[PDB]
Amino acid sequence: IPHLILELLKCEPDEPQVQAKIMAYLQQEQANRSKHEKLSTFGLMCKMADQTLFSIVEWARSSIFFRELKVDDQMKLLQNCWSELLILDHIYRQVVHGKEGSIFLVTGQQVDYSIIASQAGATLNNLMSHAQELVAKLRSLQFDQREFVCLKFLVLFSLDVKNLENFQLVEGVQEQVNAALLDYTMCNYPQQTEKFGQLLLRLPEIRAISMQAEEYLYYKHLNGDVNLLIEMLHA
């Protein structure tokens, strides 16, 4: 394993504790609400991703390379990749813990697909099934954690952000992480000459699914259907 990939794996959060805190927050603010005041299933998912955004920010906040940029550069990177990290984390959770016909939430709760599908609507189901199709290919490619953290840093240190005062590091990490992933998939996965290319090509698809998820959630917010998640959705 390249030592750069080892450095990326250290900034990974304590997932059992992240899931425990999010579940406790929702179990609090849900059983606390009145009978005529319970959250909808779409509302529960919005609060889950809102809490997930908090741990996403704290993850990058203490991650290597990222903790060297000034706060202005940190905000620009996160405001460009926040929905992609949510989709990437959701997709990887279904690759690891996922079972067929089931969706695993950030709280560790397993939901059957056809129940969520009845309430997601036309657009979300197409966005969810497209993401589930990406889960199927990543599963067939043996998508592991070492390649998951590099894809996270490739999304975080996106070349699609500007007004950066230190674009040299963002560009430097992008090329450097890309070279480490190419070396990892080659050394640890011969047999699969298609894996490295197939891995990077999900990024435009994750970028497209996430950007289409933003435009629908913004559509839902203007209709009065949805607060860190909302402030990230603006501008």
Partner: peptide, 11 residues
């Protein structure tokens, strides 16, 4: 975004 800057500046 005051909330995002706060999450990156708080202790």
């Amino acid at each position: 975004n005051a909330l995002l800057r706060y999450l990156l500046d708080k202790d």
